[PDB]
Structure formats: structure tokens, C-alpha cells
XYZ file of C-alpha atoms in Angstrom:
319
model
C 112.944 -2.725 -53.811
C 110.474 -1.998 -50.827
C 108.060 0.982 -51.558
C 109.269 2.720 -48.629
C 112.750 2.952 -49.713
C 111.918 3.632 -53.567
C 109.939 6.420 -52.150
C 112.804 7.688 -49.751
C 115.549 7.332 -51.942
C 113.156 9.238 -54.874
C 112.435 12.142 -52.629
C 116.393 12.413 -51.419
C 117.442 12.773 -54.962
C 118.050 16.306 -56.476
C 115.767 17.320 -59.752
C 114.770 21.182 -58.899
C 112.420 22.583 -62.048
C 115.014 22.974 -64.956
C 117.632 20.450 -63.576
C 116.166 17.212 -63.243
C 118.989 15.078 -65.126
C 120.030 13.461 -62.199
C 115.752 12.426 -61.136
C 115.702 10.738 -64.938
C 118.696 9.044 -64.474
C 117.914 7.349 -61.333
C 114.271 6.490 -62.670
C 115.852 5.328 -66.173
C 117.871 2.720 -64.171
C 115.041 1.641 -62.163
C 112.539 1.169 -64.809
C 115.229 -0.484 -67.358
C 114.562 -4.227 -66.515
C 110.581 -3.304 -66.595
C 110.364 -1.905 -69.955
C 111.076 -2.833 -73.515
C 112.652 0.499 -74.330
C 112.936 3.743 -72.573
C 113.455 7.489 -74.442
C 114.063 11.170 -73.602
C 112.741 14.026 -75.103
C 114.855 17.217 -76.018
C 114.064 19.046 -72.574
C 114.615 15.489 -70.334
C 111.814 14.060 -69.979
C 111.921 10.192 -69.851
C 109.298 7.532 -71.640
C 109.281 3.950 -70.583
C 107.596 1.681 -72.977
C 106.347 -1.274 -72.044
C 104.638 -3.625 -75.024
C 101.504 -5.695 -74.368
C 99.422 -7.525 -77.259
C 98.561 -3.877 -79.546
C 95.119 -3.142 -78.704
C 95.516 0.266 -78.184
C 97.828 2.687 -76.353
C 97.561 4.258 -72.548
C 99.607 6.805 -71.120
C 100.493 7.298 -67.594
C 101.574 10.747 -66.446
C 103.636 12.088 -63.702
C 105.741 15.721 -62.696
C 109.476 14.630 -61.393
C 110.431 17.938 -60.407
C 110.821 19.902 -56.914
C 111.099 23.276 -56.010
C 114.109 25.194 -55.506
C 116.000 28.385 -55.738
C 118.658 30.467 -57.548
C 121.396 32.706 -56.102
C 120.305 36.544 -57.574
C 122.177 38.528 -55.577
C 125.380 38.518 -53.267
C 125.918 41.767 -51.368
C 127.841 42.411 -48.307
C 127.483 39.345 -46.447
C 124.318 38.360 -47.456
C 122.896 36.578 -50.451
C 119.541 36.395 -52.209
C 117.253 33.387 -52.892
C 114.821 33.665 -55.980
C 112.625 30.885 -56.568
C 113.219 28.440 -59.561
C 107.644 26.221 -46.463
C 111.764 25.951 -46.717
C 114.291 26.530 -43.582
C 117.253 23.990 -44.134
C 118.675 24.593 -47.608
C 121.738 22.497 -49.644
C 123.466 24.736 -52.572
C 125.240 23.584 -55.356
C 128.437 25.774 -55.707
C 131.557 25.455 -57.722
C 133.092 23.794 -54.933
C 130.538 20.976 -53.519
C 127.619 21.571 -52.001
C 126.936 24.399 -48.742
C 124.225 24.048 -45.909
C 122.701 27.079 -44.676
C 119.434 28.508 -43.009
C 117.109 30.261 -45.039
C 117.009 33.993 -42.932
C 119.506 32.872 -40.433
C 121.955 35.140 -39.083
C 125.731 34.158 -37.649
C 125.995 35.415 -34.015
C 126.233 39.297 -33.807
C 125.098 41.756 -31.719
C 123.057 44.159 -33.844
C 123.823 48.178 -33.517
C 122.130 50.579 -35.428
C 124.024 50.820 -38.309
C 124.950 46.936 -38.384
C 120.675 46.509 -38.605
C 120.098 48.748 -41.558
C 122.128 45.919 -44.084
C 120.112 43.011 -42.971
C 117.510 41.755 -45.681
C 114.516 43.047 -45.364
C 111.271 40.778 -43.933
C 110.191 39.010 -47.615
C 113.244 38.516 -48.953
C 115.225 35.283 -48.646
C 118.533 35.378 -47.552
C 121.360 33.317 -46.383
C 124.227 34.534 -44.575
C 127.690 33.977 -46.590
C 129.722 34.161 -43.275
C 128.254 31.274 -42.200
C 129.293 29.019 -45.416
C 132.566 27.267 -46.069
C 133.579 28.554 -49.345
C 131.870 31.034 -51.969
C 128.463 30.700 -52.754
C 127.819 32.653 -56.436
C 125.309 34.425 -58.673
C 123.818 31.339 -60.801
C 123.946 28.876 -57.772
C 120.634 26.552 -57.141
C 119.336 25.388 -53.560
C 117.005 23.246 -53.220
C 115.706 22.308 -49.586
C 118.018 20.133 -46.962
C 115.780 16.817 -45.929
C 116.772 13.175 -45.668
C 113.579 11.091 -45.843
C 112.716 8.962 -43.241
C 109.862 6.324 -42.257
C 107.705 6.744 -39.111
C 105.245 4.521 -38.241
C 104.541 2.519 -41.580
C 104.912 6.477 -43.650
C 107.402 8.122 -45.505
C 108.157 11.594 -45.085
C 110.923 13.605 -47.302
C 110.686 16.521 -49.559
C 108.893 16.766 -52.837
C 106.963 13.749 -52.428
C 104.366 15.655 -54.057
C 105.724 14.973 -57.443
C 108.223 11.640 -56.258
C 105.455 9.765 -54.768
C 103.954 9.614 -58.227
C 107.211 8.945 -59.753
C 107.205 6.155 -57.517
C 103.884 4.609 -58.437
C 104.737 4.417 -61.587
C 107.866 3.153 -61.560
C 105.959 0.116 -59.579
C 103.682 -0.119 -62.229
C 105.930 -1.198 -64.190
C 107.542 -3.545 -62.196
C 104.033 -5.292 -61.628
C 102.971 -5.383 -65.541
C 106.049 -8.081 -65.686
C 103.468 -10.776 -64.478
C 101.234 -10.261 -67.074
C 100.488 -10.895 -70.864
C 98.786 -7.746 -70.375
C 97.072 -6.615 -73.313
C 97.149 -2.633 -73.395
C 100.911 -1.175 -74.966
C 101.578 0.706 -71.999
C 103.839 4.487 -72.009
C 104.994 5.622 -68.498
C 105.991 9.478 -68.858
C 108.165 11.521 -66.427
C 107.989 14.963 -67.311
C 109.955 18.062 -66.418
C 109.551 21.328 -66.182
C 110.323 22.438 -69.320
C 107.544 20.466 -71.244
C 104.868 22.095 -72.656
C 102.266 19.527 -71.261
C 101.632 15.999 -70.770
C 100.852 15.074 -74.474
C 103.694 17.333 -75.563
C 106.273 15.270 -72.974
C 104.988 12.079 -74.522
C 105.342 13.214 -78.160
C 108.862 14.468 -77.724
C 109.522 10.618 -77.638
C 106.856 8.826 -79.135
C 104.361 10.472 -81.988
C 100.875 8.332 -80.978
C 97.972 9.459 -79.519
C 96.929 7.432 -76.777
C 93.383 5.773 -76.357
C 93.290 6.429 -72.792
C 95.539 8.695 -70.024
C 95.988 8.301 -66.465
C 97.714 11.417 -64.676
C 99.032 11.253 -61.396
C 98.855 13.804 -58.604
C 98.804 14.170 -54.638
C 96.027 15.737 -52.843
C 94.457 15.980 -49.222
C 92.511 18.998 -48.375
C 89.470 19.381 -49.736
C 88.523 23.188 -51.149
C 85.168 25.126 -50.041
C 82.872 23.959 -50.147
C 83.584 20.448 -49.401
C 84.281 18.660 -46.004
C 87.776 17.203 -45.877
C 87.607 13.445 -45.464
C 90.558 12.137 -47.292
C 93.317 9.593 -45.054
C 96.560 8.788 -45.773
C 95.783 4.795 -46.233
C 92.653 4.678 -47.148
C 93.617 4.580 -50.630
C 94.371 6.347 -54.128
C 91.983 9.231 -54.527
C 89.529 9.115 -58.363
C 89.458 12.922 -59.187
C 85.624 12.977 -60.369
C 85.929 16.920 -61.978
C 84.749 18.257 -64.706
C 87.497 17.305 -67.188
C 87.826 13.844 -65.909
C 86.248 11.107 -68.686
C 83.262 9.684 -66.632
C 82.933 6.727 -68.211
C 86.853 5.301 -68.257
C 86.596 6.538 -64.641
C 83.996 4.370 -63.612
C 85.658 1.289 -65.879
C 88.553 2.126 -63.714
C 86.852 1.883 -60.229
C 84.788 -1.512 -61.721
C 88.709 -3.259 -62.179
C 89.702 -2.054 -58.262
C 86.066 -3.236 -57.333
C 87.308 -6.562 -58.544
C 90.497 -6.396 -57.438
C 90.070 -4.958 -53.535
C 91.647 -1.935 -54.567
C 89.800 0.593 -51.480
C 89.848 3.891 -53.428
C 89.104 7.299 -51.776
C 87.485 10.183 -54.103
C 86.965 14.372 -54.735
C 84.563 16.264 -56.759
C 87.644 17.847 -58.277
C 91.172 17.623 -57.811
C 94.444 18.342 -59.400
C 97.131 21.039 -57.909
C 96.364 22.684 -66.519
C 98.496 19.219 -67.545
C 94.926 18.656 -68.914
C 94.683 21.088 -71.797
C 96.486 19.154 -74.497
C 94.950 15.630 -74.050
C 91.278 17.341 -73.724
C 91.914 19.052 -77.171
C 93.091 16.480 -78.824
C 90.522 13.750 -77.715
C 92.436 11.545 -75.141
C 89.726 9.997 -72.227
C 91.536 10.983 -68.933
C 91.366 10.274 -65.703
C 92.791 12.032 -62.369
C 93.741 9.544 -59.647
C 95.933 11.171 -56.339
C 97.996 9.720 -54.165
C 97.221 11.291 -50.268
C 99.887 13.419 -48.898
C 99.632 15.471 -45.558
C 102.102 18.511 -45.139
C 101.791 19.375 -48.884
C 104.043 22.280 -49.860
C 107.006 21.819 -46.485
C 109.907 20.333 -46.020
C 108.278 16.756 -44.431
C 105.463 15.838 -47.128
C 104.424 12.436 -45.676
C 102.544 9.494 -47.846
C 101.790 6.372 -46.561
C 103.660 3.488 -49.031
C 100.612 1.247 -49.171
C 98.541 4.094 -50.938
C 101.466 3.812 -53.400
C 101.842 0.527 -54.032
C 97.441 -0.177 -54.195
C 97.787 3.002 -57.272
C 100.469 0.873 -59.057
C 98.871 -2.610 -58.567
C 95.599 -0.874 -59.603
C 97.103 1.083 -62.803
C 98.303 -2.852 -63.863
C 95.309 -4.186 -63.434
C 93.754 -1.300 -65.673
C 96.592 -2.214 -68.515
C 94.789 -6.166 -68.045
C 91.157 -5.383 -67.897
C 90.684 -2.417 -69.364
C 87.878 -2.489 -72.370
């Protein structure tokens, strides 16, 4: 479909860390007619596998979950949020699903005593008198946003995780016009994974020759001067872990190819540990997100869709 509604209709879905069945399912179906066979691990993470000609294996790399929260405590009228930035929240109950107000209180006029059982400043709280039915220990919120488009962007929650779900799910779409000759893996990893390489070897036991991981970014840490823009591209992470050398192959195929590319000394929000141990060339490239961490995360869809075209390419020209 259009990379604006992939993109909306990934960060709509529900996958909060621990609980991302429903994420998987929706990329599984999307990916299907791309790849030649698609696996999931033990904890849910998803592998699509797309065969090119055999010489030699790359692995692309993205997070699918999103934050969210867990009833911990109901007392009185209140009850307690402890995570798994958010106002409008949706909970998953027993009965449906509830929309409250993270800290709101229904209408009272406070007294004295009334004040002393309202949650104190940190904690977060919903009021149960405001919700239709029961709300119970065990529960899980995650926040209340419908994505929506605004001038050629996307904005919806955990896009810092879906956007990348998105580019690679476009990846894969694109690699169907070519006789491309990389075997290509496309992971989707939850929470419960012990890192990238472990995700990918819950499914498939290879090492691969060369991994791309995905990740958002747009401020720039001390002491560098922010300059990154939402459509001016998919940013190269050029840190210290990065593989210089398969980096600059990679920015010699979008040279090529038009693909305008944006860059960072470092990078990343370590998924890196495993494939640095055991040998794997990496490389970092972010997609450019503004209002990282809140409710309305917005990309721009081009930025998207250049990453995926430019990750095909690589799986063509690469070596």
C-alpha cells in the first residue's frame, strides 16, 4: 500500500514490550507475498526470508515493540500504572478495552480529608470512577493515538520502533523486481529477545556476512550541533561500532542510486553486542523522527520509503 498508510496503520496497532502477537501478525501478512518463507522464534519474533542467488547472507534488524503499562495497584478509587510523555491511555480489561487520562480526576470538590487519598505527584494513576466497567490488577495500557498525516508526515505513537518496521517491510516488497543476488533475512524482534543475532537464530542458525539495524534518531548529543531534517533522508550512524568499510560500500550504492542520506558521529537509542562478538560487519542507518518519546512521533514517509529502496539496492550491489 502507500507508505503513509503502512506507517499509520503500523503505529495504530497494539504490540506493548511482552505482547506483541498482534504487531507480528499484521507484519507476517504483509510481508507473506514478499518472501519465500517467514518463521517465529519461541518469544515472537518474526523472520522473513527472502532468497536471492547464495552469495552470502545479510540481515536486516528492527524493534516492533511500544511502550506501555501494567495495572499494580487498585485502591479506593484509584488505580496504579507501572511501566511495562503519555496522557490519553486505552486498557485492555476483561471486558473490552477502557479510555482514561493518565492523573485525571472525575469532577469533585476536594476537602481535606477527600485530598489526603489522591495519588501522590510521581505516581500514575487513573481514576476508576471515571471507567465503564472494572479495570484489574494484571491489566496493560498502552497510550490512546490514532495516526494521522499532516502535510506530506505521519504522526502516531511508537513510530520509533514502527517506522522501521515499516521500512523493512518495503524492502521487501521492492527486492520483488530483482534477481538480486544477496539471500536476504528481515528480523522483527520483541522484547523478549536476547539481541539481534539471538532473534535471528531463534529461526534461522547462520551467521550473516553483513547486518543492517534500523533505528530513529534526531537530536544530536553534546557536543554536536543538531542538523538532522525530517526529509532529508535516512541517517548512516558513523560510531565507533559501525563497520567503516561496508558503511562507505553502502553510501557508494545510494551515491549511484540518488539516495540523499543524512549522517551522525554516533547514533543508536546495546542490539550491537552479539553481532560485534561474533564477527558480523554492521551498519547503523536511522530513520528521522521529531517528538521522539510522546504520544505524536512524526516521520516523514519519503525518508521511509528512500531507506527501503536503498536497503534493496544494497541486497543488488553489494560486494
Amino acid at each position: 500500500m502507500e507508505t503513509g498508510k503502512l506507517l499509520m496503520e503500523l503505529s495504530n496497532l497494539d504490540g506493548p514490550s511482552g505482547y506483541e502477537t498482534n504487531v507480528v501478525s499484521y507484519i507476517k501478512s504483509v510481508i507473506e507475498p514478499f518472501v519465500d518463507e517467514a518463521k517465529t522464534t519461541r518469544h515472537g519474533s518474526l523472520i522473513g526470508y527472502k532468497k536471492g542467488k547464495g552469495i552470502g547472507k545479510l540481515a536486516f534488524f528492527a524493534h516492533v515493540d511500544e511502550i506501555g503499562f501494567v495495572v499494580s495497584k487498585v485502591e479506593g478509587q484509584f488505580a496504579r500504572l507501572e511501566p511495562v510523555y503519555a496522557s490519553k491511555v486505552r486498557i485492555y480489561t476483561k471486558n473490552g478495552i477502557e479510555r482514561g487520562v493518565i492523573g485525571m480526576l472525575a469532577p469533585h470538590l476536594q476537602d481535606s480529608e477527600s485530598r489526603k487519598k489522591v495519588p501522590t505527584y510521581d505516581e500514575i494513576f487513573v481514576d476508576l470512577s471515571l471507567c465503564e466497567r472494572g479495570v484489574r490488577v494484571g491489566d496493560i495500557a498502552v497510550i490512546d493515538q490514532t495516526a494521522f498525516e499532516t502535510n506530506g508526515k505521519v504522526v502516531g505513537k511508537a513510530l520509533d520502533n514502527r517506522a522501521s518496521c515499516g521500512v523493512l517491510v518495503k524492502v521487501l516488497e521492492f527486492l520483488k523486481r530483482y534477481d538480486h543476488p544477496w539471500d536476504v533475512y528481515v528480523v522483527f524482534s520483541v522484547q523478549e529477545e536476547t539481541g539481534c543475532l539471538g532473534a535471528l537464530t531463534g529461526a534461522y542458525e547462520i551467521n550473516p556476512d553483513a547486518a543492517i539495524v534500523m533505528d530513529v534518531t534526531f537530536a544530536s548529543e553534546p557536543p554536536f550541533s543538531d542538523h538532522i531534517e525530517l526529509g532529508k533522508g535516512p541517517v548512516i550512524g558513523l560510531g565507533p561500532v559501525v563497520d567503516r568499510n561496508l558503511v562507505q560500500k553502502i553510501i557508494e550504492i545510494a551515491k549511484k542510486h540518488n539516495v540523499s542520506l543524512q549522517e551522525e558521529a554516533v547514533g543508536g537509542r546495546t542490539d550491537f553486542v552479539q553481532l560485534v562478538r561474533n564477527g558480523v560487519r554492521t551498519s547503523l542507518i536511522s530513520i528521522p523522527l521529531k517528538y521522539m518519546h510522546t504520544p505524536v512521533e512524526m516521520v516523514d514517509p519519503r525518508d521511509v520509503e528512500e531507506l527501503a529502496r536503498l536497503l534493496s539496492l544494497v541486497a543488488v550491489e553489494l560486494e
